[PDB]
Symmetry: C3
Subunit: 105 residues, 3 copies
C-alpha cells in the first residue's frame, strides 16, 4: 500500500548511502519519508547522481530540501539536475541511519 523508491548512491570517493523514499496516504493527508543509511563517515557534503525517480521525490518537499537527524549530526539533502547534495552540520565519523518526513493535506 505504501509506495517506495530504494537505491544506493556513491560519491567519487566511494562513500555509499542507501535511501528509501516512501509515500503513504492517510485519508486527506499524504506523508513522504526519506530514510537514509550509511556505514561510512563524511568530512564534507555527500554528492552523487540520483535516479530521476528519487530526484523527483526529493524535489517535492515544501522546503525544497530534507533536514535529517543522524546519531552524530544533522544533514540537509537536496537535488539539482539529478545530483544529490547532502550538506552536514559537522564531519561525521559514521553516518548511521535517520529519517526525515513531511505530511501535507
Amino acid at each position: 500500500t505504501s509506495l517506495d523508491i530504494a537505491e544506493e548512491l556513491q560519491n567519487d570517493k566511494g562513500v555509499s548511502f542507501a535511501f528509501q523514499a516512501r509515500e503513504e496516504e492517510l485519508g486527506a493527508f499524504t506523508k513522504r519519508t526519506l530514510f537514509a543509511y550509511s556505514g561510512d563517515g563524511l568530512t564534507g557534503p555527500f554528492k552523487a547522481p540520483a535516479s530521476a525517480e528519487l530526484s523527483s521525490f526529493l524535489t517535492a518537499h515544501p522546503k525544497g530540501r530534507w533536514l535529517i537527524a543522524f546519531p552524530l549530526g544533522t544533514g540537509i539533502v537536496s537535488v539539482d539536475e539529478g545530483i544529490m547534495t547532502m550538506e552536514i552540520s559537522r564531519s561525521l565519523p559514521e553516518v548511521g541511519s535517520g529519517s526525515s518526513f513531511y505530511l501535507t493535506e
Copy 2:
C-alpha cells in the same frame, strides 16, 4: 494490525502549524503507539493548540503521560490537557523539522 492511523493539522494562536500523525499497531502480545510530528515553522517557546478528541485520547494513553520527542535541532515534550496540546521545547528552534516518539507495551 495497524489499528489506528490518524493525521491532523494543529495551529497555535500565532500561526505556527504542525502536522501530527498518531499510529497504533498490534504486534502479537505488544501494542506500539507512535506520534509523528512535522513543522516547517520555527518555535520560540511552547506550542499550544487545540487537538481533536481522538488525538487527545491517543496522547493521554502514554505510560509517562507525555511524549518525549527528538527533532533535528532540539527536543520536545508533547502533552494534552482537556483537548489542548502543549509541546514544550528544550531551546528555541529556528526550524522544527520532523520527528517521532513511540512506546511499546504488553
Copy 3:
C-alpha cells in the same frame, strides 16, 4: 499485501530492573531490504544495559553489516550488540530517561 516479512517484539530487563521493549522489523522493498530495530524505555540508564535476549532477537541483532546498532535517543546515543544471546547496549552519557529511537540499515 504487506511488505513486512518480520515483526517481533520483546521486553528485556537487566539485573537492576531497568526494562526495555525492542521491536525488530524486516521490510522487503524490492531490490532492497530494510531491517529496523526500535527501542523504548521509560527508565534511565546510568551505564550499559545488559540483558538476555531471545534466540530470534539475537539472530536479528547479529545480522547487521556493522555487527551492532548505532541508535539515537532524545538525550544521547547507544550502541546495541549481542553476544551469546546477551544484549549489551553501551551509551554515550548517563541518560536520566531513555525514551524511544530506532536504528536501521538497507541492503541489496
